[PDB]
Amino acid sequence: MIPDVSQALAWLEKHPQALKGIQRGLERETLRVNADGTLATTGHPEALGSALTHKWITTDFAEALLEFITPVDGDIEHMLTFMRDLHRYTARNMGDERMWPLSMPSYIAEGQDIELAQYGTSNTGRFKTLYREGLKNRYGALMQTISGVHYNFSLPMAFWQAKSGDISGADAKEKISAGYFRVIRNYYRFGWVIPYLFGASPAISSSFLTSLPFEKTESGMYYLPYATSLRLSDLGYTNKSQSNLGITFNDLYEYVAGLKQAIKTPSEEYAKIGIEKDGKRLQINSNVLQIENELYAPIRPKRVTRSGESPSDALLRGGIEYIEVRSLDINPFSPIGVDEQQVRFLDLFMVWCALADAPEMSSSELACTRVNWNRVILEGRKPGLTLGIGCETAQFPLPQVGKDLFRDLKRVAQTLDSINGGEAYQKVCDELVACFDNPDLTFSARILRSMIDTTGKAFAEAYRNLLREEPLEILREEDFVAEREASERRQQEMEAADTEPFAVWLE
């Protein structure tokens, strides 16, 4: 079921230096909560400054939903250490609050009055806060409190140069885009390996509640015995409302047209919420997507946007720069929600996705890759589980398939280790591959176990105390203070540069 990648892998070993220079970025989301596990009600910590403009730390959907963002970097350890510094500092400046260690909320009711993210009185600030008011009315606040880790990855220019030789910058920027869509297509096909290894939401609270055979634990949580990531299921951070959009990943102009056409596409269900009600705006528009950001795909095209420019516009201007892997649940066994084993595995898998051939895929061919994903999401650890090629009959045993993939991955790993020196990548392949015959080693089995034997509050507490005792390693306090001061200015500056009133800006 896994494609032959002999030729591309041969090319790679003949061109080892094509992998030197990989760049990475991490986004990690987490809920601020009280020691009793309830949602924190305080505002965005003052030591963090403006969330609107802050470089490293900001807010996602809710004002209590922190997001930590590492600046793009090519050193794994440095990046993860930088991420920990952001945690360390925040944990020493939110009083007695602490972070939620899991993707799923445990003590948040549906309809719970949850403060939207606030971004002050600027037109951009109010626009973002309004986007979120719209999300709340559409999907509900509860779902938008679901937290995840996003893995951001780019291959070096030297990769493309070794593939294509000397060419025009118009041609080369196109090749890059095509390269990344190929990656995306392979990710849709084979990316279910991610939930299977690192999925960490086999359980959920009552609030999230189908004919699925849920069971219970003494702590009051509902779970499926073989599930990996319900965050990715219809019950979690859903994109079902969006499955009719016909967006494809074959070509840059097509991708963008479908995505622009999706912002202009009326939805019947959202009209009913209404755009304006009793003087209070409730959403940006009544369309399937309010803006491009609302595309809840498991991976997406990307280019850092210039000022005022939209995601789609950057893409057309400079082509695809990097890809954003979005399918990672929070790592409950790491105080920073993500670890070096996962980062290293995603390096190997993303590189492999760039190497393997990926036939063009229609909208309905893409919808068909979901069947294996769903299998893994809802019952990935079930003994005997089989997978198929698309919508076809399941025939291939999951362990055999993962092993097949991993023979290729160890080869990529050998190349990466021979550049950086050491054996770290190869060692990660040896650890993870054992998970296929032994699903109890996966994240979803490990945390399911711990939830039955007793969790979210206990881990949060342990992770708070561990973090506060830890000195910063890369940044200093003065760095955090200067960034806070400077973000607060950037916000004031935006608040004073507005010439038109919020109302005219929109239209």
Ligand SMILES: Nc1ncnc2c1ncn2[C@@H]1O[C@H](COP(=O)(O)OP(=O)(O)O)[C@@H](O)[C@H]1O
């Ligand atoms: N060239 C790139 N290659 C790899 N990662 C990148 C690159 N450019 C930016 N990134 C990373 O992408 C992430 C952007 O995060 P963020 O601002 O939260 O965007 P978004 O919300 O759309 O996911 C950063 O963590 C950054 O380090």
Ligand SMILES: CC[C@H](C[S@](=O)(CC[C@H](N)C(=O)O)=NP(=O)(O)O)C(=O)O
């Ligand atoms: C504001 C809400 C979301 C934001 S989200 O897509 C959320 C990701 C989600 N929590 C997840 O678990 O993957 N994270 P982002 O990558 O935009 O920082 C939106 O833009 O519509």
Ligand SMILES: [Mg+2]
């Ligand atoms: Mg983000």
Ligand SMILES: [Mg+2]
């Ligand atoms: Mg986010």
Ligand SMILES: [Mg+2]
């Ligand atoms: Mg992201």
Ligand SMILES: [Mg+2]
């Ligand atoms: Mg093979």
